[PDB]
């Protein structure tokens, strides 16, 4: 009655044959995960950075951003492990463009099949140049199509409390970061990591495109991402102190999102958040193992222009390289303190 | 690497043939939805009551309670439209029993195929005696197996913000109630009702057990459910006044959950919430079109007692409802 109808959907398996992953694409993914893992579990003293657009709607522009990021990465690779934000799914407050997969032509034609091809082609393009990628795991079905290429997965502030996403995280083969609640508190993110650490049994879609009963083993590589909210921003020393205070035993390092709740309405506050975090890092803060940055080729956003976001506003490339270079400096400074 | 493996799952279609719904069951679900709609849209002046166990783990116990609730419902049908809570899925803060479907044997064996047969058999058993039912739509897949027997769908506080659940809602053929956020605020439930009202495109599982691209119509029968939270209980006139102010014009009536956040860790607080809600309805509060009560044969959380959250017993449930029906009448006099 409220279901207008269904359209055929190509299986993950079929799509994976159609758009094969290069050995380089596969290697990059694996490298990405190991590095992120070593960092959040305190084995490496570099900082994990998830940098990139709010969303990708242009593969050509994403590719150019990628090329830029990949070299700035090779250079700063001694202080930072960088993973590019290649988000294909966006959670709306109510309505709006949901991303590349859902509506690739960005015109309400919702050619999901074409979305998945672009999403997968995009992923192979990026990872194929030696650049790891990360995306928000909003859909619980789309992962079956791109997992083999992802190095990090984020569960949004609006879904961190969802049992379905905790079940999803427990079976993903890479680290997962749970954003704190949209109210600015960490409780739900801590519960989410605890929950995703366990094994779960639940119905899910296989690579054959059919529903089956899944059994996951648990994901010991989940961590909390501080992204602000109603109760205020939480990238400062006092907020970080309170976060550490409530992190249970065996917890992985914290990640600080410079945007969203913490950029507090103005995307221009991202570099300022960096200053405040670099401050803590340079002075010996070892609990801050990762940061998240919404960056594009050009700053700002626009409605429905080249290197410009069509969803949230991002800092341009020029100021992004500024931030990363500062962050890297902060990291060297920490090594010193720790000696 | 983190996927221990998969096990064959019977499709919704197969289960529907194995456990067909009697005509009475289907008619019952139909009626339950129509009555619910008239009430939440302000057409009918009765109150919509979603009352039943916190979770169902015993089908025999659940049947006895259904018989008792069906009789009472029969006696109070003039003021109340009762739908039994037949919850099959329970959202955890971290880990624990998730319900009848996930682990029917409640012993960590996780026989989901058996869980789904028990669930549907349960839903048929109940609706077949003429009693409409409601459950929390936690899983985006299980509805395919049970939707035809459901008159009311509830979206939990921990998933009201989820876009997947908002998309799910936009496609359900019955009224959907969105619980306010766990932080005790209403915003997300209001945004949710708006999102759910629109048509959506997303991948979902069909009656055949295969994934396809779904296009929904939009659900205009979504309403907000007040269930308290971190900021405090919100079933008082003040809180109700603020809630009403947040609802855009044309919004459906509010439902007040007597439990969870508004119970404040003590199930004995449910009848106290009732008194407060009854006062408002009796004095003429027309925005409160429904209530939700967690009750069982016996109170607390052994036969007839909940294995999840604490519920009030039957006697208490009976007193609470009688009094609610009275407020409904009083409100009728007042509205005149």
From Swiss-Prot, chain A:
Q: Which GO terms describe its biological process?
A: amino acid biosynthetic process; aromatic amino acid family biosynthetic process; chorismate biosynthetic process
Which reaction(s) does the protein catalyse, per the Swiss-Prot or TrEMBL entry? D-erythrose 4-phosphate + phosphoenolpyruvate + H2O = 7-phospho-2-dehydro-3-deoxy-D-arabino-heptonate + phosphate
User: GO molecular function of the protein, one example?
Assistant: 3-deoxy-7-phosphoheptulonate synthase activity
Provide the alphabetized UniProt keywords. Answer: Acetylation, Amino-acid biosynthesis, Aromatic amino acid biosynthesis, Stress response, Transferase
- Indicate the secretion signal residues: none
Report which superkingdom the organism of origin falls in: Eukaryota
Question: What does its record list under induction?
Answer: By amino acid starvation.
Pathway-wise, it operates in: Metabolic intermediate biosynthesis; chorismate biosynthesis; chorismate from D-erythrose 4-phosphate and phosphoenolpyruvate: step 1/7
The record's Pfam families line, in alphabetical order, gives:
DAHP_synth_1 (PF00793)
E.C. numbers:
2.5.1.54
Instruction: List, alphabetically, the InterPro entries matched.
Output: Aldolase_TIM, DAHP1/KDSA, DAHP_synth_1
Q: What else is known?
A: Present with 26300 molecules/cell in log phase SD medium.
Family of the protein in this entry: Belongs to the class-I DAHP synthase family.
PANTHER family xrefs: PHOSPHO-2-DEHYDRO-3-DEOXYHEPTONATE ALDOLASE DAHP SYNTHETASE, PHOSPHO-2-DEHYDRO-3-DEOXYHEPTONATE ALDOLASE, TYROSINE-INHIBITED
Please explain the role this protein plays, according to its UniProt record: Stereospecific condensation of phosphoenolpyruvate (PEP) and D-erythrose-4-phosphate (E4P) giving rise to 3-deoxy-D-arabino-heptulosonate-7-phosphate (DAHP).
Name the record gives this protein: Phospho-2-dehydro-3-deoxyheptonate aldolase, tyrosine-inhibited
